[PDB]
Design a binder for these strands. Sequence first.
RNA 1: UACCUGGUUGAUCCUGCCAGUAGUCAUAUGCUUGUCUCAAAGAUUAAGCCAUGCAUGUGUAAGUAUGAACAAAUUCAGACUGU
Length: 217
Amino acid sequence: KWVPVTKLGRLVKDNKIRSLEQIYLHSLPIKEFQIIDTLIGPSLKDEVMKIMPVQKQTRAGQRTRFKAFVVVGDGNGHVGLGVKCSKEVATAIRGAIILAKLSVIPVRRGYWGNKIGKPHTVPCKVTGKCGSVTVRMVPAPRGAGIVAARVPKKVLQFAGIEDVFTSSRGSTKTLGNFVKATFDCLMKTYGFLTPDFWKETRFTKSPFQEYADILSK
RNA sequence: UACCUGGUUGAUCCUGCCAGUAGUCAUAUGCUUGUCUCAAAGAUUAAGCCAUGCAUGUGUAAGUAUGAACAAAUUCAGACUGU
Ligand SMILES: [K+]
Ligand SMILES: [Mg+2]
Ligand SMILES: [Mg+2]
């Protein structure tokens, strides 16, 4: 079936780690998509966003390969992006799905004004940049909806954000750069230091130290 | 009610524009047009030229009646006292 090759995979298969937040807290790399499948796999949905052909000139013609972009998300604060180039479209799509699962990230959602109910928009103004494409996300009031182009709108819907305003600059027709900039903007949500995070951190044992005895075999 | 997409390359990222998408109590034109309620309408070029018809007249007890205007009365007198 599945034979984990990493300590994190072994712990996830042994059920010692039960939530993705435990991994996110210590920022441990995730190198097996089976971890994501076991943890948040049931609630994950994938979508192919673009099949982009690329060509390399050769002495006997052009070698064509296809680029697959895949967006995965749970619609509840977890989203991931994957890009895979391969000779076959099916292989490219499979690799892109695996990469998106591996690259899933947590997304912070806040409130525009009054803080009643679950979060509906980004906690603060954020900006992501990939190549020449810059995507800016601004909080919006409840009921404003997702004001964004189709690609960022799909990314935000998979991330689970209810309402937001967006602005874009640069060559947004470059779909890869557009989606990557949106992903970077979403990732930057948890990197902003707000007053509510001013409390001193109370550290906890990392998984590798907590279950060191189990992993010692 | 804070949104983009196609087009320079063998392929890539850009600048950059062209094209597309939507709107006008915005004009005109093409085709089509069964019912109800609303409703603009010779401004844009020529404040260019105009046949014909109409669009400014007016009376209360209280300015002026002798129509040779009508009507009722007067057998005798009457300036006039209804229109
Ligand atoms: K008018
Ligand atoms: Mg604007
Ligand atoms: Mg060509």
